[PDB]
Amino acid sequence: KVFGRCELAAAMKRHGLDNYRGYSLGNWVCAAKFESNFNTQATNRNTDGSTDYGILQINSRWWCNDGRTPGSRNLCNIPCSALLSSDITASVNCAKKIVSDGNGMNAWVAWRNRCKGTDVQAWIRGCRL
């Protein structure tokens, strides 16, 4: 599913991301836009053989099981296909965990390079929240 901006904001808010680990909602919306273009089905293969899945491009080295990422972990205890669902529930749960791992949202390269230090509130402007 391809979310609309405000539709995703609302969904993220209901699943408890505004202001989670001190990250206001706009940070999360911004990260989704640039990681996936707001597509739940987005997959991207990396140079190490890992793959990034879903709206927040969660990576198979560490957080989910794809069966083709040898010596990898599965911290989130899920099949990476769970992260492509139209229900962003499992993505959000796993991302909590990620944003707890010590580097905060710097775990998302797109966030660091395109959202950090910007007016992230612009991503939720206009929305009924």
Ligand code: NA
């Ligand atoms: Na894995």
